[PDB]
Amino acid sequence: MTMEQFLTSLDMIRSGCAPKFKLKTEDLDRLRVGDFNFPPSQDLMCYTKCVSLMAGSVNKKGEFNAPKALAQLPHLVPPEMMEMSRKSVEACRDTHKQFKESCERVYQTAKCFSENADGQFMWP
């Protein structure tokens, strides 16, 4: 996909998940720029789970599926973002094993992606 399509995809992905939760605009804004440096509500964390399920990188138990994530990447991120994402998958493949609850697992993996991003990270 193109970068222009990717940035617009972010809003489309959000629209399919945001209405299911009680969320703060400020919080969503901060996640959009890859800033996970604030305490999340349960709603925000489950929001990140809803996003990842849509992407197909996790199951209902919030377990990160590294090979399918890597199989999916060309359908999720533009070519310019491939290297960074692959590195983030690898660095964060074993993050969900420290957490038991489904929403928290995904959130912590998402947070890991943002921190282990060698560039600008963007969350829907």
Swiss-Prot record:
This protein's UniProt keywords: Behavior, Disulfide bond, Olfaction, Pheromone response, Pheromone-binding, Secreted, Sensory transduction, Signal, Transport
Main location: secreted
Disulfide bonds: 17-50, 46-103, 92-112
Positions annotated to bind ethanol: 52, 57
Entry comment describing in which tissues the protein is expressed: Specifically expressed in chemosensory system in both males and females. Expressed in a subset of trichoid chemosensory sensilla located on the ventral-lateral surface of the third antennal segment. Secreted from non-neuronal support cells into the sensillum lymph that bathes the olfactory neurons within these sensilla.
Annotated binding of butan-1-ol, by residue: 52, 57
One of the GO BP terms on file: response to pheromone
GO molecular function: dibutyl phthalate binding; diphenyl phthalate binding; odorant binding; pheromone binding
Binding site for 1-propanol: 52, 57
Record's subcellular location: Secreted
GO cellular component terms listed in the entry, alphabetical order: extracellular region
Family: Belongs to the PBP/GOBP family.
Chain's role: Odorant-binding protein required for olfactory behavior and for activity of pheromone-sensitive neurons. Binds to alcohols and mediates avoidance behavior to high concentrations of alcohols, the alcohol-binding possibly resulting in activation of receptors on T2B neurons, the activation of these receptors inhibiting these neurons. Acts in concert with Snmp and lush to capture cVA molecules on the surface of Or67d expressing olfactory dendrites and facilitate their transfer to the odorant-receptor Orco complex. Required for cVA response, probably by binding to VA.
Protein name: General odorant-binding protein lush
Gene name as annotated: lush
Segment of the intact protein contained: 30 to 153 of 153
